[PDB]
Design a protein around this ligand. Structure first.
Ligand code: ATP
Ligand code: ATP
Ligand code: ATP
Ligand code: MG
Ligand code: MG
Ligand code: MG
Ligand code: ZN
Ligand code: ZN
Lengths: 260, 161, 260, 260
């Protein structure tokens, strides 16, 4: 049982990807923009679940490699770090395609990145946290989207929109967006029920997501998927730590008052 | 541990040239390098082509004995004995005696030797298939004619009885 | 029994040639380049297994003893020294052949290597670690390829790609290129399940690339076939030395800890 | 029939040049400047079509080469990357002339740049996106114009005007300018009609570019050539994908609401 308890707590620590209508809409729109090389910019709140949806769109087109040619990765996902320069960005592009860099000037990195980009036949350039990179690199990404014809999706918080708004070309060229919703409603109840079924993976004690539980979770998460994940995982781990097989009212109240 | 080298035991009747060549190839040395190590200078590079204008002296052989770790008398036993005349050119080879043991016999270079006493074969002065003269014995990395890549042991059945 | 154990660990510690799909497609590519006599350049990231594939290729087409003429050698495999001049390249290419040249000068050596190349009618020249060569030597390599019509296969890592991109006339003839495979995807399953008994040759614990074993391997090798090779062999040595029947989880986690 | 759809979507994905009064005026202006050897600076808004028209000018009168002499390349078109330095400018200027770069310092690079420019006998130099290259290079472009007598032309957004404003000599020398218009009004209707005639290349649907769709295009694109291109192509591909033969009001409204 102790080994089973350790397995349960380790699984609860690990986050999962339940496919729901938000990620469904996102990757449907992503496929639509991919089929026409339309460079858009998906936007949304913080801790809402855009990156996970992007991740899923990245893994679904798992690259299929030929016997003796470079693999065809159709979707490229990068998450440049804070104040990411152009050399760093090109390094990331060529590193994702599994092409280790060689020391040189920025021009050398740009040329190698262009070469590996055309050779691999990439279709998508997903730049999450696109509010981090410097504006001297937005010209580079503009040229990438222009000459190489790769649809770029600038992903980030609403601060990304402010970052690109002060610029001239990047705002006009990247205008199509997909704002992430709050999810509050009956769809939220469906979400929490589905999370109970799959993510929690607890024995069926007929919790059924009662009205009091729904009110507590609504007051806690405020519609955030990440908040819901964190609170559910914390409640499950706290119940399993005190020997409680299922999740009762006290742990929900404790985590809710701890968070707010 | 004690200072060492890739020692080679001398054959029976091998040449000084061939023995020094085997010693060099097993130590990755050079004629100038072997001479400098021995302390006698480029004289070694001369011996590999049998130019014994000043016969290999007792001192010039003791200095070698110090390096190749072969007794000086055993060294003199690959030079022609005092008074015996050898021809430094052409380099001569018996195929059968090479098949028996892969070496170059100093006795083949004697002016008075034309027949292999233990094979009754007229020894070869040039490659029997392409008429290419043989190299210096020290230059025999392996037993083959340089121009035609024919093994030395093969030539035994081309050389006349 | 310790003699049998020592023989087994001697087999493990020894590098063994093992058949993959990538080596077979490389052999097909190189046969095509032979029949075309067209220059190529196989490139791949480190430890991906280019050297062993080229060695297996050159063993496949072993040289034949010719009776009328000196023997013809189909392929020449040379691994030069770091920052070695063209003189040393000529020395190595002659020494690989039965021929041998001493004394002389660079022009004499180049003439001699031209003659020995035309005499043997060598088809391909697989230079391993091509980037070890000085840039001036690349002009000589071009001259050899152009004058003798010999397909030169430049084997190396992406540093070779950068080096050939540095100069124009060197890269001029090497239009084609074969990119080696990282082996990511489902191919990992086949390669691990084959390597379990093809190479290790011990009574298997029916691991069959189990979930725990496969995930611990992907956490250490990342598709590097050499990585999994030496990891599995060293782990088998550890398991057999301590008296265990077959490998377990503890030794794999220890070797993964010492690797990552 | 599906292959016909593939051909149509491939044709729509590619971008063709539509002749108009503005590009003709640019052609006449550049002809006058080249016949006068006058260093001008064309300017315009975002998505107004400067790059396409400059490409049309460079493609109109191609370099008629001599059989064994260097081509008499009259026009050199480059778009140096963001924060382009003098060496990078020379590299682009020599790569346009089909003359491979020789490694060296900036002095010899500039020397060979000058030699190849004089050998090709270039008349006018057209530089796209000339708001990027650093001011250290505008001195060298001024030197080219002064000593060789080549009409240097700069393309960029209105920020290029301020870029030359902060410096004195370039502000004075590049004093002839041509602002790109908005093309809205009756000329916008003529552009729409001729786009429907030639760019769409679809069956005659008797739409005749009605007033309602004129209003929709004015409200969505606001007269931008690039925005008109984007919206019309997206509407066409959406209509063709769903099996529709002509364009519909719903598709145009959909692509309009997705942009504003
Ligand atoms: N489809 C999903 N299935 C399961 N969990 C999800 C899903 N989408 C998001 N999450 C949860 O959301 C949290 C993190 O979300 P994510 O990192 O995708 O946010 P984001 O919208 O990209 O925002 P941020 O910029 O704040 O990181 C995690 O707890 C993760 O489990
Ligand atoms: N086809 C193969 N079969 C068996 N082992 C292989 C194979 N390819 C590579 N290896 C293993 O990889 C290691 C050597 O790899 P190899 O030198 O061929 O790779 P490489 O990608 O050319 O890299 P490097 O240039 O750094 O040596 C050894 O551990 C060897 O066992
Ligand atoms: N004559 C034309 N025919 C067709 N499409 C055109 C034409 N002119 C411009 N476009 C469209 O405009 C876009 C390219 O415009 P262009 O590159 O000239 O913009 P720009 O305003 O000069 O850009 P930047 O802001 O980078 O300076 C493409 O979508 C292209 O299809
Ligand atoms: Mg995120
Ligand atoms: Mg190798
Ligand atoms: Mg433009
Ligand atoms: Zn004999
Ligand atoms: Zn011969």
């Amino acid at each position: 049982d102790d080994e089973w308890l350790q397995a349960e707590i380790a699984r609860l620590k690990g986050k999962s990807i339940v496919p729901l209508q938000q990620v469904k809409t996102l990757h449907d729109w992503l496929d639509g923009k991919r089929k026409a090389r339309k460079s858009c910019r998906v936007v949304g709140e913080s801790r809402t679940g855009k990156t996970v949806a992007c991740d899923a769109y990245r893994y679904r087109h798992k690259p299929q490699q030929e016997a003796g040619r470079p693999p065809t990765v159709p979707v490229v996902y990068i998450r440049p770090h804070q104040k990411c320069g152009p050399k760093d960005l090109f390094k990331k592009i060529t590193e994702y395609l599994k092409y280790r860099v060689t020391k040189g000037t920025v021009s050398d990195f740009r040329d190698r990145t262009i070469e590996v980009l055309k050779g691999c036949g990439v279709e998508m350039l997903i730049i999450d946290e696109a509010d981090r990179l410097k504006p001297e690199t937005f010209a580079d990404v503009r040229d990438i989207a222009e000459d190489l014809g790769i649809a770029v999706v600038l992903v980030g918080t609403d601060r990304l929109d402010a970052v690109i708004k002060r610029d001239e070309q990047v705002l006009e060229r990247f205008r199509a967006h997909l704002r992430f919703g709050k999810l509050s409603g009956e769809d939220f109840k469906n979400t929490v029920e589905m999370w109970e079924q799959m993510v929690l993976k607890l024995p069926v004690s007929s919790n059924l997501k009662s009205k009091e539980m729904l009110r507590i979770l609504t007051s806690a998460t405020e519609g955030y998927i990440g908040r819901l994940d964190e609170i559910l995982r914390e409640a499950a781990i706290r119940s399993l730590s005190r020997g409680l097989k299922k999740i009762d009212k006290a742990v929900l109240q404790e985590v809710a008052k701890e968070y707010k | 541990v004690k200072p060492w080298l890739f020692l080679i035991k001398p054959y029976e009747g091998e040449s000084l040239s061939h023995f020094l060549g085997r010693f060099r190839r097993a130590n990755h040395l050079s004629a100038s390098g072997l001479g400098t190590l021995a302390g006698i200078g480029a004289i070694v590079a001369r011996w590999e082509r049998f130019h014994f204008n000043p016969r290999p002296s007792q001192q010039e052989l003791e200095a070698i004995a110090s390096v190749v770790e072969v007794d000086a008398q055993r060294l003199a036993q690959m030079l022609p004995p005092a008074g015996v005349g050898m021809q430094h050119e052409p380099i001569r080879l018996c195929g059968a005696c090479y098949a028996e043991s892969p070496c170059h016999r100093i006795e083949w270079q004697y002016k008075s030797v034309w027949k292999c006493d233990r094979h009754q074969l007229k020894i070869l002065a040039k490659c029997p298939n392409c008429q290419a003269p043989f190299k210096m014995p020290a230059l025999w990395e392996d037993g083959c004619c340089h121009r035609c890549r024919m093994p030395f042991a093969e030539m035994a059945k081309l050389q006349k009885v």
